[PDB]
Amino acid sequence: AKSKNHTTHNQSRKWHRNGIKKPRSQRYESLKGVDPKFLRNMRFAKKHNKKGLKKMQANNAKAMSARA
Amino acid sequence: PVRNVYKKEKARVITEEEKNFKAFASLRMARANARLFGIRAKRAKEAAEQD
Amino acid sequence: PSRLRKTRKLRGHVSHGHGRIGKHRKHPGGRGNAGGLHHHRINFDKYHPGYFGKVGMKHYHLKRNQSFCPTVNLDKLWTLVSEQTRVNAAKNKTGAAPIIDVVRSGYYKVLGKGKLPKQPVIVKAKFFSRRAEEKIKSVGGACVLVA
Amino acid sequence: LYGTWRKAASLKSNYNLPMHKMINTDLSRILKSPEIQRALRAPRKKIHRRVL
Amino acid sequence: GVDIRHNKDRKVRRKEPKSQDIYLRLLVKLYRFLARRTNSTFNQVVLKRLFMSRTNRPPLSLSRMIRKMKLPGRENKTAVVVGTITDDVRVQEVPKLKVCALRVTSRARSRILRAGGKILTFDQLALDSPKGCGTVLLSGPRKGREVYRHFGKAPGTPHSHTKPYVRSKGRKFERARGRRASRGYKN
Amino acid sequence: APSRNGMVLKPHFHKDWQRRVATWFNQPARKIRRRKARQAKARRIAPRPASGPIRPIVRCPTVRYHTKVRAGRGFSLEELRVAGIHKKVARTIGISVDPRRRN
RNA sequence: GUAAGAAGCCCGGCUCGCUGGCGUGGAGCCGGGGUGGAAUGCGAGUGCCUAGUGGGCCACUUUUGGUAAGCAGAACUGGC
RNA sequence: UAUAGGGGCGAAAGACUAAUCGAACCAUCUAGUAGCUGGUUCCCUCCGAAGUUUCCCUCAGGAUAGCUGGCGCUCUCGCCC
RNA sequence: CGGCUACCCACCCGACCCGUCUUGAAACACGGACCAAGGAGUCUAACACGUGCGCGAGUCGGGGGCUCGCACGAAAGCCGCCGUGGCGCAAUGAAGGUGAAGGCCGGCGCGCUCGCCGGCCGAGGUGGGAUCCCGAGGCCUCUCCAGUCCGCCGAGGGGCACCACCGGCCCGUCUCGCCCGCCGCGCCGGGGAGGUGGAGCACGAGCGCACGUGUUAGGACCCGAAAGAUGGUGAACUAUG
RNA sequence: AGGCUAAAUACCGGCACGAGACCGAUAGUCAACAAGUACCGUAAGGGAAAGUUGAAAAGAACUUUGAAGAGAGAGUUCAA
């Protein structure tokens, strides 16, 4: 009652029935896995960007609109 | 025989410091007092025992 | 509808929708949840994780009756009383506030959400959350505990 | 027993008349109205059959 | 043989609406005529949404239909919804905007008529805008359906966050082997 | 035996449920029987009203249903003594008497 | 296997509780400038439900065991 | 006349026990279960495989993935790039 | 006269007897003498998905009641201070329990890796994103003038559905830190900043009905056993007293 | 640690009754009929097949072949 054990015949033809797909697109890539000390940098940097970017960038926009 | 009584109490003015005293902490303080009522009595009995 | 059933459409095919080779006879894999640990672990696991074992305490004679506390939100806190009532009670009259008694509506515990306007009310309930209590203090209402 | 769309039914407690999907539903009147025929492309009745 | 390519004959599409509603078929006829005779891609998309199923047309809500017109540039525009606009318990004030939807609920219609807005139907929307000018087409929360929260690669293999089927959401039901590290494995 | 992603089922049909099937085919029959029973009661018994004895105002023992009210069973002998009438005289007047209900 | 661009370059400026001789470095955020960046062909992405299948064989070429087999067992491709 | 079924009887062959005996006959549970043979009922149109990975007291079977069909949704083109 | 045709015959060519188990059937593989009737995926419950309908943050009378005694009426109509109740609108914990809003401006405490007061907006931001809006400019038999008219558009803006990422809030554990309150100052409660696990929130879409597919329990696509138990009938054959 | 009591509930046995999106003599109960009958086994027990003339019997008087079964004429009936 010996049977055929293992083969990879008729496998690439099944693979190319659907055109094997790259993930091909991740705009603004996934962030998990990166260094937790770098995350402790980046989250506080982002929320203080939300806090204190207003007036200096506003005056810089006024200055660059006056210059050009 | 139902007679579902309907109390309304529609008009009253905003009042004194009941609104400053009836906060969330009263329920937690009452819960902690009900959970630690008897152990304080045991500690009072032990304080009376230890002279 | 047997005339809409697939069986009337499949009259003429020999094996009748179940193959000549595999031969689905009576019960090929078992019955019900057979082999939950032995040979169907890729179906019981990977589709129902957590299914095997004990988890916690065993509260004997439990009822879903003592822990009865329907939660009302601050969005649902207004329409228990009609809109005519709150308009004619907060149409710039005086410092009086209407009373919304959620125990009459059947809801016991008041929880917090957003969308609570400036016009203050008085809420009588058996329980509160600190978030909803701070929202009532922020809009200027009165938090009243009842039994 | 049923009412109009202004009031509710006075005999049935929680019933109102259904919502009317197309109010003025004369499709020939709509398609021959000047408001629709103001914004039509052109009557294109050429056939352009197979040329041997 | 000619084509070595696979025979994928029909693409995906639903041509005729499967609903046998006579009023829906009349709206399909009218907006099909407008979509093929007015060069209006708004009429194209509204005709496709009338071809769309009952389930894939989610019910719009009154607070969302306010907030999509609260944005600057949507003051004098009309809100066109292929679907139902329902009541919301959350909001208190309703603006003076116009509504063009199918099968608006009774409390929503009552509050719009109290606020002073104007509700319409699709035949009146077609008579007022054949090309669809002055309109904003809206859609509703499809992914917030209870059915779509069971859909994923797995219930728990990269923990997968996708809600396995069970009777009672609580203790003793699917919480032991694969849900905690003390009992066997953990996801 | 199981399949693709679906809820685990434990149906209680292993016991021979085919013998013990009770289906309400006599549900309009019981409806007509009980209509005739009520009408024959109102004919034959008395000009006493239907649901003859009067039921008390009674609160429901729970943390759940005690906000509501209920028609009870009987008038709680201390209450009947304060009302000032005899027990079986009250039962013949139409007062429902339950000796167990406290106050 | 990777790259053959607008998701890419360049300039100016804020934030950081990361780092630190230094406005040093690195990440994030904001504003602006120019899209003609190998060939060929094709209109693409994505969600749900499920049957059958889970005994294979043959042929060129590369091979394992056997003296060899219409023998047993592998790789690519094609066919039954 | 007595011994009646896991019982009887046996100068012992596991032989006999109503043409059936290495556990009689009749009825009921019972339509016992079977991964195992056989069969499975009108037409036309369209698409269309696999005998492979892993796991199982698994090797005639099942679960999973792959292959497949159906139902759609989101867009793109018809008017020097 | 013409006629395809379930009529018969001849001629040329091709043509092994169907169904299945199988890699392989015409097989020296199995079932089939012939014919007529019957004969095999049904039904219930539960779940999931898709579709259609009504109502829609609600939905549903299936449980009863009301009508005069009506064949069809074992139907149908109504209840609403009959919504008790099921599902959903809130989850997280084994549990005690707890429980989903933030943003902007001005002032103060050393705007302090730091809390408070007054006013305003209100479910955040980024890159895509059908559609929509504004619009330089161009074009209709001779000149200035015009209104709708024939008529697209570089560029710009607001941005459904959903996608990808960041940030925010809720619960349970983990780390580090200071403050507040007294129906009573205590091994009392609450709050802060980070990294986590959850079937969560981040303007909710469910309920009921019906149909289709699939799975499970029921005899369950049809037929099939060696076996087990329960209760009775036989020594007219045979075996022994 | 003594006791009774109608009610709403169940009823594939029985007596009478009504209805059917059910079957229509290989179906429906085994049994539309002299059906638990014929018949089988010592016994417990097993257990069938089997409806239809015509409106009315008016069921073909009479002649003839044959011993009769049967046949050829004649007749009844809308139709042998």
Ligand SMILES: [Mg+2]
């Ligand atoms: Mg194999």
Ligand SMILES: [Mg+2]
């Ligand atoms: Mg087939």
Ligand SMILES: [Mg+2]
């Ligand atoms: Mg096989």
Ligand SMILES: [Mg+2]
């Ligand atoms: Mg199978």
Ligand SMILES: [Mg+2]
């Ligand atoms: Mg061809």
Ligand SMILES: [Mg+2]
């Ligand atoms: Mg093909």
Ligand SMILES: [Mg+2]
């Ligand atoms: Mg299967």
Ligand SMILES: [Mg+2]
């Ligand atoms: Mg059984």
Ligand SMILES: [Mg+2]
């Ligand atoms: Mg199948």
Ligand SMILES: [Mg+2]
């Ligand atoms: Mg080989």
Ligand SMILES: [Mg+2]
């Ligand atoms: Mg071999």
Ligand SMILES: [Mg+2]
């Ligand atoms: Mg070939």
Ligand SMILES: [Mg+2]
């Ligand atoms: Mg011997």
Ligand SMILES: [Mg+2]
């Ligand atoms: Mg021997």
Ligand SMILES: [Mg+2]
């Ligand atoms: Mg013998």
Ligand SMILES: [Mg+2]
């Ligand atoms: Mg034996």
